[PDB]
Amino acid sequence: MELTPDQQTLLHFIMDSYNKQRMPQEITNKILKEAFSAEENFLILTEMATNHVQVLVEFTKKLPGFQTLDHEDQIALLKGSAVEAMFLRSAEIFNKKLPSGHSDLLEARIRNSGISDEYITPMFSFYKSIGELKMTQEEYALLTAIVILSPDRQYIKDREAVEKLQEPLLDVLQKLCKIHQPENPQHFACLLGRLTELRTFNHHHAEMLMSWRVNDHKFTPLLCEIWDVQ
């Protein structure tokens, strides 16, 4: 039931790499301070997402066994998980506790950022349902690692090799779920269930970006490689 010394070592190593990401407070301070036009908000999103992918590649490289994978499979895992990891991180930031009234303002500011109405509802439906899990930082870190090391990703030549790397992370997450939420034995299944909803954002990511209420949709060369844009 308890984590082994090897698992505790794995967990702290993954926590340390995960903590290298841009701080949630930095992001919410910017959105909460003042209101921006849809044009300014689009630019904030592309810079935020560019930094996210850069740090995600650094986090992915540190995942045990990742560097032993075939180079083409490495690209396929990164490309297959980038958008999902971005929405998982956004969901984590959204659910961080803030002073009274701040989360209501954050929600209203995101709702009026320039994103199409069609996508506001499924985005907030996902954020609120992630929030009901009351996940710890370790649970978000492991889930992000599990998302990256998905063997069921398209163009993966050697699935078994990816499975071998994901399995120890799934076992660590399962133990944490039993430790953090012993009254809810369904917790682990609920976290895994949320990965299916994550996959839906990846299906409509390009349309979500192109329907942003701006006249021009400019993307960084790194974003064009990761997103199906320009």
Partner: peptide, 11 residues
């Protein structure tokens, strides 16, 4: 041809 991704991966 994910040249930038390949680059950040092989760095």
């Amino acid at each position: 041809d994910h040249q930038l991704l390949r680059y950040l991966l092989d760095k």
